[PDB]
Amino acid sequence: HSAAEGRANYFGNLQKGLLPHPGRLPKGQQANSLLDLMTIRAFHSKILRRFSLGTAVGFRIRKGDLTDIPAILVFVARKVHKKWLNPAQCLPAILEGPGGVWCDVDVVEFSYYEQMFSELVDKLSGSDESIGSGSQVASHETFGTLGAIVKRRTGNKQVGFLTNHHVAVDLDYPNQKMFHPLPPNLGPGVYLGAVERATSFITDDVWYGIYAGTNPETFVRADGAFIPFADDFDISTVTTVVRGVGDIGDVKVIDLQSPLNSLIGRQVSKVGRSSGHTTGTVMAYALEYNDEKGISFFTDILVVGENRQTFDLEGDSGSLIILTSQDGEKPRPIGIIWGGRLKLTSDHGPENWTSGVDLGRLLDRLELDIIITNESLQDAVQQQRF
Amino acid sequence: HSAAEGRANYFGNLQKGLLPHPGRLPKGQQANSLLDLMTIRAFHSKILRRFSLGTAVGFRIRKGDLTDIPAILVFVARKVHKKWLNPAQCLPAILEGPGGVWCDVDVVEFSYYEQMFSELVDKLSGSDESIGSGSQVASHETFGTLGAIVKRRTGNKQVGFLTNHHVAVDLDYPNQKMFHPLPPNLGPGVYLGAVERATSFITDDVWYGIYAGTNPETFVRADGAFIPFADDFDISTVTTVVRGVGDIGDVKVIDLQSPLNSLIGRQVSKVGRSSGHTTGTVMAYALEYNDEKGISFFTDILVVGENRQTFDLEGDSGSLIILTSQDGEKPRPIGIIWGGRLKLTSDHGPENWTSGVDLGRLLDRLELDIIITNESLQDAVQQQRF
Amino acid sequence: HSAAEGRANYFGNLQKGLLPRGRLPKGQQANSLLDLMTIRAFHSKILRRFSLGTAVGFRIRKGDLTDIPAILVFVARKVHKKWLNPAQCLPAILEGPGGVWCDVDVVEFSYYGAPEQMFSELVDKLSGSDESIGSGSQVASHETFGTLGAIVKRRTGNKQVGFLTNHHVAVDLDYPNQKMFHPLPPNLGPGVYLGAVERATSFITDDVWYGIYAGTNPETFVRADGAFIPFADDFDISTVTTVVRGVGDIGDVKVIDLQSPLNSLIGRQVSKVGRSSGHTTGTVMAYALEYNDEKGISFFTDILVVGENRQTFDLEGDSGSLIILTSQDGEKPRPIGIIWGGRLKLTSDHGPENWTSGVDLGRLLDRLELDIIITNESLQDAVQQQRF
């Protein structure tokens, strides 16, 4: 009947099919997928969530370096030696899931707690003759980054752009009008259009396809806004190139059944109005944060910048998170930056961390397709007039 | 085609059917309706909006007292003698509309810029055994007032309550759950339900049925939230009585073609969690405020408290604005308080002013009906189970 | 061995001998402060949950003090039973360990208090326009202003004569010697040197103060603000008066016995004379108030006073003031406490009233080994005995 009663039933039967190892290697299959790790974390949510700030899935971190061992990352405010912790507080090293699928449990010091100057940043902020990924999109109050030139799959098949919802939508005013570079009250700019569809919170069952936690009120922070280009807008100013990266391919969907090496540990790049071109590493997926109001919130992609340099700054929200080319293939996008420190090494200090929204799932919810070539763009314009 | 092009056409033809009095009494018909005053104000919006903070329609105010002369109230920050004003600044005394309908122009000093203790306030805040109009409804952050026990007209015909949207809906979190008296993080309370439909901004053409201004971006601040009662909620705790007023009748719709005496100048009463029972006078309708972002905003009902006492305080939002009985008839509701001073007399200081939303139009937009007797309530419960 | 192990033993014994009970024997009804404190101590856990604090006294119904012995439970918002969870709703009666039973009253209440200016002849006199120093006089260190509570003499030792005030005003341990002046310190204005603090109390454990375990917390401390300032050698005792201005000549300290009828303290009219509000009257509403912080420590305050006719009993700066019972049969009024270094809602018609906190004078005088001087002859005699 109710979604809560359905979720309680699913976890009820997982407990009902259960049985209880003297230091022997786990007999069950080791996790090799994101779904495997997420299922184990869901079953053991309560005592993972206790004495913890959040949880995520990925590979174990040892001495600041990413291993190849699938793991549930448990985030703590202060990581101390086991000798100073109570036996209840010390988290396990291995967790056994419902169907025998097992994984490791890593502990990472973590907290949920500037404008860079380059030729690119100048171009993205209004000096370039073209609008594209990275361009500063602004409403009358907030500044953000254009993520992708998109077209609607159904209906009018309208051509527009995708960015983060918080930057585009402020539901304290009637229309949400977007301009580049600045809105009329703050500076020069051209009217791009208004937000027509937006997503803020999606339930985990619809987003991931599985129950990612025990909380009846569990929502994914799926920030996303589609702005159809205005009728008077000139599409010849639009480019499908990601400046600083080049021509990109189509969205790479995050399949929960694929090997973790396909996402976790992969190098990613982003181009935004505030920090320009940065590179980073995907460190975790499906981060869980529990507020004081009883709601469990999920963020898809967790990225840490490379070489102890921040991956994003305030204003890079909406930027496209693009996988780097491994085999000469065109780099493919996997996420957008959502609207934050972790301590990896003892020698150095805390590094910054950023959040991303799964692009494939966001594009599905908003029923949007990414335009990756100029030929496709002009074709999509013609299809819109149709 | 576009709504702006339709609005521009309507005002274009009104200008096209035009012609130009030596102090002779206006030959046209004097306004006798809200629509008449609103049409004249719409035609002359520009130079009424210039050298002004806002405009509204009602009766002229002379020496602090309400006259019987239909008028367009022009609100100014400082009212000075004509000798100290430039000829362009001095507003006219009479304005002639498109079809010869004429009205007067009144000038009122105005600005858009506490908990009372009584037995009633205590009952409304959680000491009474019943929930009804006036009861403190609270989300996890904002406190407000329950306006009316309502039932949906169509669909499931669900029974719930009406309050102001801003108090119930905060679109920074997934669900908007309402409790009485307090939410779980701040104190004891019972779960009432969650918001299922809400209205924030309606265009003037849909709300009023006419173009109330020349601005292409013109919206009515029609704050409203319907919260269907939870399945587990006990309806025997619900009362249809307005404590401090008694049994009330059905909504009195504000017809724009009725004589102005039916609304302007009428005594109204409200019962809220913060100020309790207060009385006031309806002073104006369809107040226009122009922001710095180019959007024209409209508020329906303007109320000033009687005897220089405030009509509302922060927290009375959602309260039902009820007309007082003139002929022994049950008092009938006309509005809800929306989520502020005017100088009427020289002897005393500035009085406070409050805003109301047209209940008939809000009930139509949300497709809701007010329940005014316990028999009707239990009948509506049975119809919901149906 | 440890006090915690002794306290844990005491409550473990009470649980072991407990025989649970419907309607319960009348005549086993509490008639003492100790009776109410023992019941509250046993049921500390279930009372401390969903509550800001507890105290013992008389049940309050419709804002008026009844004669029914009760444990007052203080809540941030008092709501109707229908909006409460069954676990949240408090009992109306609680049976103690030995079958002694009492009532459980609920009061809306807040701790939002750290401690304005009232203008009268007394306030002016207390602040430095009187030719005499006594109870109510402004005592000032270099930073904080307070009120002189009582002219006192030490029981043992040199038997020195000085005055009593609150310790948080007198002692600021960030510097070595705490010097008091009247009216003002030399950095802010004119004044004479009264002396320096020689002994002070801040926290006493409940087993020492009350003589019983008032709670289950291994860390339970009574906020017993108290400071003795022996008068300086050069100080002129002829400037000192033992009269409480606004009340007159006072009797000796009235000790608060826990076995006496609650009538003797709860509900009694009290008066105070302080530098900030002058003469005010109030009513003792509760005894032994428990507050649980976020750091796990339980704190106790002795006397709770609410001003009469919806007027505040004290203001910031009145700390140190003597809380004095009113005369009932013409007897000289007798002091029972000092104001410690705060709102409750009693009536639905009116708004929240302020509450103030008092320290048990008899127990503070015992810990500090001080005696109150109530007549000028006793003063001069004590000055001579100090020289002896």
Next chain:
Amino acid sequence: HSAAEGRANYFGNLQKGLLPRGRLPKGQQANSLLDLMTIRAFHSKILRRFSLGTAVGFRIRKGDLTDIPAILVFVARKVHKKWLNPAQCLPAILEGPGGVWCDVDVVEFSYYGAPEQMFSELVDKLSGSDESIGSGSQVASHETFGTLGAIVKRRTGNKQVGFLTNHHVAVDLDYPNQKMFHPLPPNLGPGVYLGAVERATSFITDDVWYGIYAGTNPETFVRADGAFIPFADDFDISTVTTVVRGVGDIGDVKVIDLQSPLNSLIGRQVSKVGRSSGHTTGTVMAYALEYNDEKGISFFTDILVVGENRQTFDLEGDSGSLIILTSQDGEKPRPIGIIWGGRLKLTSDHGPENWTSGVDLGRLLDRLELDIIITNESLQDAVQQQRF
């Protein structure tokens, strides 16, 4: 009659004799500051709209100074033409009243400036560790700290010897006599009394200062900060040095003639020595900068300087410092201004640089009737002439 009616006449005449023009005669290109200022004055309205301010100088292209005479127009955000309204986009060339034409350059620019500490031997010396007082020395009133600009002598009257600094630092008209000390005022630290301000300039009208109508505003004023502090009678002149520490011996003031080639000022390297940043170098980027407030008044600043190698030319406290041209052919370096009591974006690669404001020294010296002393012999001679 009125200055406004005279100014309105001047521009009414220029419009009446104006013969509008495609490509326009080269050789009628501006070659002077006056030429650029006259074109900007005529076109003030269309330039002041959509702009934060204007100045005259050389066009800037790709962050480098060109040799093309231009009116620099300062904008909060410089965007590509495609995101601009046709009315918003500025011209590339503007023809003046008499056919004299110039270019129109756009620069990102902000007025976010009211005026840190740099550590060096010079700064220490200027702040009170040197045995001599001169240009760069910290001059202090009881509230504000500044920089001694130049040792000066009055041309007429008693011909008294004193020093020149900025008036906002020297004069605070909320009290009668403005006393200067070095290094510090008596309320804050040690120091010797230098003297009190006897004459000061704050606002001069543009017709008096420049000799022309620099704008169409009836209310147009040049921010001409300047204060003369005659040395006290008791002051010891042997402590005064005419050397600019960090530069050496300087020549006499180089006047800024509006009819001279822009090469003579725009783009020239300048140096300054102040109490806060010490010795810094910069480049003169523009002259006669116009700022329009919200109260309807147009204000003008003479010299605009940007520091070299992306380092700030000045800091708060450097006001009063002498802006000194660098030597080109071994000649003694000559002063051209003083720093008035501020960011621009030149390059896309790097970030916003700071800009500072200077007052025309030759015109400030004229209004205040002062002459600069550039050698110790001239100093002592002037001391004797004052006694005469």
